Amino acid sequence: QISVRGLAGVENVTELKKNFNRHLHFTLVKDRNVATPRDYYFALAHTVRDHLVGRWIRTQQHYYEKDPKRIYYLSLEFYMGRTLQNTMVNLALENACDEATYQLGLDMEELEEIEEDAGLGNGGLGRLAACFLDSMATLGLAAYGYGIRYEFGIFNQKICGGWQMEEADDWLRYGNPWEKARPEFTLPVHFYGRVEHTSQGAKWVDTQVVLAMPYDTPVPGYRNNVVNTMRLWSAKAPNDFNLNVGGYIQAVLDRNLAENISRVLYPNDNFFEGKELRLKQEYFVVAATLQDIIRRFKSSKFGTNFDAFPDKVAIQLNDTHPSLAIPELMRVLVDLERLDWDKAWEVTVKTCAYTNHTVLPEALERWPVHLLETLLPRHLQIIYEINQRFLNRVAAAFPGDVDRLRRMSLVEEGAVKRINMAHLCIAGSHAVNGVARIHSEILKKTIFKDFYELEPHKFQNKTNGITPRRWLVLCNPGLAEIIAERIGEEYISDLDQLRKLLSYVDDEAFIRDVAKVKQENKLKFAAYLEREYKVHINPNSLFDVQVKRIHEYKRQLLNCLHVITLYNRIKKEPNKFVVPRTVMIGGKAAPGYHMAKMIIKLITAIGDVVNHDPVVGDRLRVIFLENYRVSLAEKVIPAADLSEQISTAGTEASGTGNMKFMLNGALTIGTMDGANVEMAEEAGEENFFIFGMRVEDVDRLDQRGYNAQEYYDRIPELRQIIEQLSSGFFSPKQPDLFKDIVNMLMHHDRFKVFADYEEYVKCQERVSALYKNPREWTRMVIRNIATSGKFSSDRTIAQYAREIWGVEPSRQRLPA
Numbered sequence: 001q002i003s004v005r006g007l008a009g010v011e012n013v014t015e016l017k018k019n020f021n022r023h024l025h026f027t028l029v030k031d032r033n034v035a036t037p038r039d040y041y042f043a044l045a046h047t048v049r050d051h052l053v054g055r056w057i058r059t060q061q062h063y064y065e066k067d068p069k070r071i072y073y074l075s076l077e078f079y080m081g082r083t084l085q086n087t088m089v090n091l092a093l094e095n096a097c098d099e100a101t102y103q104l105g106l107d108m109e110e111l112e113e114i115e116e117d118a119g120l121g122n123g124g125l126g127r128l129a130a131c132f133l134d135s136m137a138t139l140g141l142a143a144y145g146y147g148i149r150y151e152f153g154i155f156n157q158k159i160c161g162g163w164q165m166e167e168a169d170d171w172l173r174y175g176n177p178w179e180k181a182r183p184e185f186t187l188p189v190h191f192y193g194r195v196e197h198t199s200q201g202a203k204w205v206d207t208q209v210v211l212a213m214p215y216d217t218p219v220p221g222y223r224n225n226v227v228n229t230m231r232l233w234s235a236k237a238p239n240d241f242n243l244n245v246g247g248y249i250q251a252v253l254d255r256n257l258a259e260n261i262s263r264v265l266y267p268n269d270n271f272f273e274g275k276e277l278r279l280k281q282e283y284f285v286v287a288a289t290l291q292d293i294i295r296r297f298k299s300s301k302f303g304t305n306f307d308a309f310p311d312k313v314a315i316q317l318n319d320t321h322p323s324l325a326i327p328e329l330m331r332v333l334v335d336l337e338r339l340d341w342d343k344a345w346e347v348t349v350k351t352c353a354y355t356n357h358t359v360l361p362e363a364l365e366r367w368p369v370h371l372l373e374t375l376l377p378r379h380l381q382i383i384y385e386i387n388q389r390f391l392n393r394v395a396a397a398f399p400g401d402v403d404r405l406r407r408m409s410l411v412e413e414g415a416v417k418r419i420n421m422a423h424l425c426i427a428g429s430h431a432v433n434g435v436a437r438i439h440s441e442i443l444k445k446t447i448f449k450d451f452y453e454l455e456p457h458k459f460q461n462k463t464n465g466i467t468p469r470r471w472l473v474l475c476n477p478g479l480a481e482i483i484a485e486r487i488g489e490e491y492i493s494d495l496d497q498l499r500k501l502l503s504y505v506d507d508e509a510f511i512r513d514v515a516k517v518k519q520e521n522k523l524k525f526a527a528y529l530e531r532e533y534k535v536h537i538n539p540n541s542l543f544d545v546q547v548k549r550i551h552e553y554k555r556q557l558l559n560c561l562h563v564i565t566l567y568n569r570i571k572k573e574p575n576k577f578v579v580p581r582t583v584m585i586g587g588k589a590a591p592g593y594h595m596a597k598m599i600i601k602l603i604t605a606i607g608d609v610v611n612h613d614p615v616v617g618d619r620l621r622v623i624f625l626e627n628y629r630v631s632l633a634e635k636v637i638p639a640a641d642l643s644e645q646i647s648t649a650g651t652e653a654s655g656t657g658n659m660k661f662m663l664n665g666a667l668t669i670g671t672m673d674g675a676n677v678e679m680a681e682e683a684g685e686e687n688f689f690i691f692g693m694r695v696e697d698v699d700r701l702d703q704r705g706y707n708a709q710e711y712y713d714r715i716p717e718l719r720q721i722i723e724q725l726s727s728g729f730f731s732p733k734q735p736d737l738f739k740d741i742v743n744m745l746m747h748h749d750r751f752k753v754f755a756d757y758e759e760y761v762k763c764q765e766r767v768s769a770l771y772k773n774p775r776e777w778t779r780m781v782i783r784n785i786a787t788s789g790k791f792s793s794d795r796t797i798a799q800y801a802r803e804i805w806g807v808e809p810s811r812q813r814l815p816a
């Protein structure tokens with residue numbers, strides 16, 4: 001139907017149809033008369049997967065022969081979403097499969113909805129890993145993603161009585177056609193035990209063993225015949241585990257304890273919990289991965305001599321979660337390979353690089369020493385030794401500066417002794433990067449200032465990106481097509497080409513097409529809400545959307561205050577015209593985060609009042625988007641008009657949702673925080689709705705002391721809202737329901753919601769004004785899309801490759 005989705009050749013469609021029928025018969029063991037729609041999805045998935053395997057085998061064969069420097073991206077999260085459409089797009093098979101399924105009397109889109117999200121991540125950090133894998137394959141890098149195969153990913157969110165309920169995400173229930181189990185590469189991981197000293201070095205003995213079994217998932221590049229690997233470890237009990245009838249039975253059932261390591265993703269978005277099971281997950285991925293790395297290095301054309309290790313291996317630590325890679329690599333080199341400390345350390349530093357993903361103090365990993373002492377006794381010893389040698393370097397560089405020593409130490413003294421994992425990562429890496437220019441500067445100026453002064457060369461910026469494959473071509477084919485009509489298809493792997501669209505900003509045909517694509521997206525999403533959730537919205541209204549995990553710093557509460565302001569203004573002057581809005585807010589709250597759960601309840605409670613007020617009519621609707629996840633993002637983002645990016649300046653390291661909205665034709669209201677700053681710089685500040693305190697203003701307010709009451713006293717509209725919340729206007733049966741929210745806003749608000757309220761409301765008025773002028777709204781949209789090229793993860797990854805890993809990207813095809 002549409003050109004960007006590839007050709008539907010006669011030979012291809014015929015071949016797909018017969019391979020589809022073959023899988024249905026031989027693989028699913030069904031015939032057309034008994035086949036469930038799920039069977040049809042699985043038949044298609046197998047048919048598409050077949051087209052991957054030859055390229056997958058030859059790519060990995062190619063790396064063996066050419067022996068390039070290998071990149072290992074270590075993460076505890078890979079937020080992959082669905083795989084079927086992505087694979088079709090990257091292989092140029094989408095139209096052919098659409099045609100083949102049509103002729104079989106099947107709707108492919110319906111089949112696509114049957115696939116479970118691989119929800120092996122919480123939010124931005126996990127999704128970044130997924131975009132990065134796509135870009136690394138597209139850029140022809142010999143890259144491997146290494147993580148954990150959680151049996152249960154991020155919980156499914158149900159809203160019941162306005163409250164979040166969690167249900168297990170049993171994503172493997174029906175099986176995963178995309179993975180290949182590789183039991184031949186099963187590896188032992190050690191826990192507990194004790195350290196013995198002998199004549200020839202330390203030995204780690206009396207350990208418990210858990211097995212690590214890899215599962216490989218293919219990662220196809222965009223139309224370059226490259227297929228890389230994401231390898232995820234699953235925990236398995238050794239067969240002699242724990243080995244009376246009750247005793248026998250119990251010994252078998254106790255195998256569950258070892259396998260619990262890979263059972264479930266920790267649902268903490270921006271917060272730290274020193275739980276033993278989490279530490280075990282962290283070491284499990286690190287120990288198994290490093291053995292795989294070393295095996296592959298020895299089986300190379302060089303391996304014996306580890307001098308060349310950093311020339312053949314790069315290890316990227318996705319935050320501090322896999323930080324145990326540093327002392328684990330030292331352990332292996334020193335204890336097992338018998339290298340001297342100094343050489344081992346040189347190899348380690350040159351091998352490892354660390355990316356920081358937040359400055360929020362509560363999110364930083366600080367493990368109690370007694371935990372590491374029990375679980376990983378050898379690693380604690382190595383960490384102590386790293387610390388002593390590091391602090392000797394500090395002492396020599398800043399003689400007499402005793403407080404610098406305590407500030408820089410990897411060991412934090414106190415009630416309980418802790419290891420600061422961030423300090424470990426800086427010491428043991430040759431590069432440290434933030435994820436947006438302002439974030440990277442904040443690192444050098446505040447939290448890692450001491451380390452920057454000691455080793456300035458180590459610190460870098462790598463502004464985040466998103467993949468234009470999933471986040472344009474896949475989720476917004478209509479916009480991809482109208483763009484390709486003007487400028488061709490090469491922008492898909494070279495997003496800077498979107499700049500050519502600037503010479504169409506006054507093109508009346510293009511303006512009409514951009515606005516038409518948006519309207520179609522909005523109509524489709526408006527229908528989705530009715531069909532799947534029985535809610536009725538006005539598709540002519542401005543689609544005002546804030547989708548992201550629920551946290552105080554992201555200030556969903558500031559959005560709530562605006563919503564209530566609009567409602568109160570309508571109730572004050574009912575017969576006055578206002579630009580109609582559909583306000584959509586969505587995101588999951590971490591199970592133990594009480595405030596975040598209260599915020600969700602507030603949003604739904606506002607909806608209950610606003611959506612049923614006959615005086616409001618269809619002029620204002622407030623909807624909480626349930627179970628926000630990658631697949632829902634692919635639907636809502638193309639439908640959005642207004643992107644809410646309203647974190648307190650200095651708190652959102654980068655953001656990536658922001659970039660997704662920019663690429664898909666929404667305008668942005670936001671603070672000068674994270675990547676918003678660079679987005680506004682690229683598009684031009686006049687083409688952005690910027691408001692609020694800058695980082696410097698926040699700092700000034702902190703020095704003076706933030707007094708929320710001042711704002712309450714001086715803003716009558718704000719006062720009205722707080723009184724409504726307090727008095728039970730939004731909870732008539734439970735008048736005090738929101739007392740905690742009011743108390744926090746008035747007395748302990750770390751994120752200064754009130755301080756930005758006035759500028760926010762005023763900026764929102766400017767948004768409404770522009771929306772009243774469809775032509776000028778769309779021209780500003782075009783100027784955003786046209787300048788979104790910097791925010792492709794292809795650019796981000798090319799910068800990592802050149803400036804950190806020391807490898808050159810390649811756009812050349814491998815043979816088909």
Ligand SMILES: O=C(N[C@@H]1O[C@H](CO)[C@@H](O)[C@H](O)[C@H]1O)c1ccccc1
Nearest residue numbers: 124125128270357652653654655656
């Ligand atoms: O999700 C996290 N950070 C997010 O990473 C994204 C990708 O770099 C950024 O875009 C977000 O701003 C940041 O909050 C996070 C959460 C807890 C600990 C460490 C990191």
